Amino acid sequence: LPPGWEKAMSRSSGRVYYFNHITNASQWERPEPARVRCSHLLVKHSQSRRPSSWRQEKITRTKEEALELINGYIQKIKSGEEDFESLASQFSDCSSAKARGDLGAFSRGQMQKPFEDASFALRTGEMSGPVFTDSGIHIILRTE
Ligand SMILES: CN(CCO)c1ccccn1
Numbered sequence: 001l002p003p004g005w006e007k008a009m010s011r012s013s014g015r016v017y018y019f020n021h022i023t024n025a026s027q028w029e030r031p032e033p034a035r036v037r038c039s040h041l042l043v044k045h046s047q048s049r050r051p052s053s054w055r056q057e058k059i060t061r062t063k064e065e066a067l068e069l070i071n072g073y074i075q076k077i078k079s080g081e082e083d084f085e086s087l088a089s090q091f092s093d094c095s096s097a098k099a100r101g102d103l104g105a106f107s108r109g110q111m112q113k114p115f116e117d118a119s120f121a122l123r124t125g126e127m128s129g130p131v132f133t134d135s136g137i138h139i140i141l142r143t144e
């Protein structure tokens with residue numbers, strides 16, 4: 001299986017699925033360059049390195065509450081009810097919200113390590129599950 005993937009069993013359905021422990025992605029179907037380009041949606045919490053953003057001068061939500069927000073955004077993106085870029089522009093606690101979450105292209109050794117590892121393990125067009133860094137919890141979309 002591709003880098004980071006394992007088989008798992010659904011508890012509710014009992015059907016086999018696949019999980020990536022580097023990107024925290026999960027899917028039903030059976031699934032390196034110098035640079036990648038990614039967008040992200042960041043939800044900060046009270047233990048972020050800087051608990052403030054353009055949305056909120058004092059970020060007060062707990063880590064648990066931020067993960068619930070991330071999970072809900074992932075649900076709406078996967079259902080097609082909302083687009084990643086729309087949710088990033090509206091709700092990302094990163095200044096890159098103004099650019100639909102786009103961070104541009106980057107190499108290894110620039111970003112926070114868990115973010116970097118998830119970005120390089122995604123395939124082009126693929127999106128992560130919740131990725132935890134010192135900034136908060138991220139949804140990552142690899143665009144190039
Ligand atoms: C302590 N809890 C709740 C118990 O499962 C957290 C904390 C951070 C993220 C998710 N759950």
Ligand SMILES: CN(CCO)c1ccccn1
Binds near residue numbers: 094096097098102104
């Ligand atoms: C990639 N960044 C900086 C990262 O915080 C952008 C992009 C567009 C607008 C503002 N910041």
